[PDB]
Amino acid sequence: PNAVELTVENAWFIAEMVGAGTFPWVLAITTPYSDEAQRSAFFARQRDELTQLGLLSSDGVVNPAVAEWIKVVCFPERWLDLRYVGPLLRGIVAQSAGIMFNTVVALRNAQLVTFTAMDIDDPRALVPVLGVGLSARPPARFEEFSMPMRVGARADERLRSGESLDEVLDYLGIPVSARPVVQAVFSGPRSYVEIVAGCNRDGEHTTTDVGLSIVDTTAGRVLVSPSRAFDGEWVSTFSAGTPFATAVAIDQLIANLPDGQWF
Ligand SMILES: [Pt+2]
Ligand SMILES: [Pt+2]
Ligand SMILES: [Pt+2]
Ligand SMILES: [Pt+2]
Ligand SMILES: [Pt+2]
Numbered sequence: 001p002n003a004v005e006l007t008v009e010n011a012w013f014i015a016e017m018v019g020a021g022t023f024p025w026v027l028a029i030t031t032p033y034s035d036e037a038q039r040s041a042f043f044a045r046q047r048d049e050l051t052q053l054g055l056l057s058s059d060g061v062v063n064p065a066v067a068e069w070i071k072v073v074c075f076p077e078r079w080l081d082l083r084y085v086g087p088l089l090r091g092i093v094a095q096s097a098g099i100m101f102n103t104v105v106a107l108r109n110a111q112l113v114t115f116t117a118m119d120i121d122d123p124r125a126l127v128p129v130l131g132v133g134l135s136a137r138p139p140a141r142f143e144e145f146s147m148p149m150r151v152g153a154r155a156d157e158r159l160r161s162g163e164s165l166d167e168v169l170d171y172l173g174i175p176v177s178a179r180p181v182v183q184a185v186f187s188g189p190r191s192y193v194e195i196v197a198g199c200n201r202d203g204e205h206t207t208t209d210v211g212l213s214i215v216d217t218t219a220g221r222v223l224v225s226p227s228r229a230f231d232g233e234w235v236s237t238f239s240a241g242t243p244f245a246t247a248v249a250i251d252q253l254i255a256n257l258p259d260g261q262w263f
């Protein structure tokens, strides 16, 4: 009742019916067909499918709850873009303070898309949400450390030259006690999410340059938190993916925005 699963084509149709051109880019939900010819068949098929789903009334009215959820996602005031990688999983956490539950989560997995209305009041409530595309690993245990992008680039060069990961972890000086975790961060199997925060305050559509990554490895969950140093270069802190640390990192990420104070 607070959630609906749809086809991506179903979703596109309702977006069109509510007046929204398109969905947030992160979802990659583009026009289903090609011609003026495909458009007409698509529309016939979708009117029919939404009706058989009770989401479109005989009188042509979009279910008011699903309509609102799709509008929140399409016309968001504040959002987190979620890009999941692992062996197309894309999400967005959207809030549209005006119209709306105060959050709508959209999760697109291949040809389907779920929309879930939630009440989120603190960043800790987001940990199970962001975790949907990960693999439910417990937190990794290791001493937090940082790596610069230039240092990472030199490591990559060495690795490309055929140096062992072991030799490259020595070059970086990773303590032996931390290597099970660090060698897992840089090996499969793994799953991760790249998160960017956005807002539409001025009607101007700012996103964080920073993007936070959460990575589930064989040695547990790790949080990677980049920051841009004064000379521009990215520097990342790698830390244990506890729910607490994750919550703080999500707060921190959002803090970069003008909006500033989502909670
Ligand atoms: Pt037909
Ligand atoms: Pt079709
Ligand atoms: Pt409502
Ligand atoms: Pt892979
Ligand atoms: Pt990096």
Ligand SMILES: [Pt+2]
Residues within 6 Å of the ligand: 157, 161
């Ligand atoms: Pt070289």
Ligand SMILES: [Pt+2]
Residues within 6 Å of the ligand: 149, 150, 233, 234
């Ligand atoms: Pt760089």
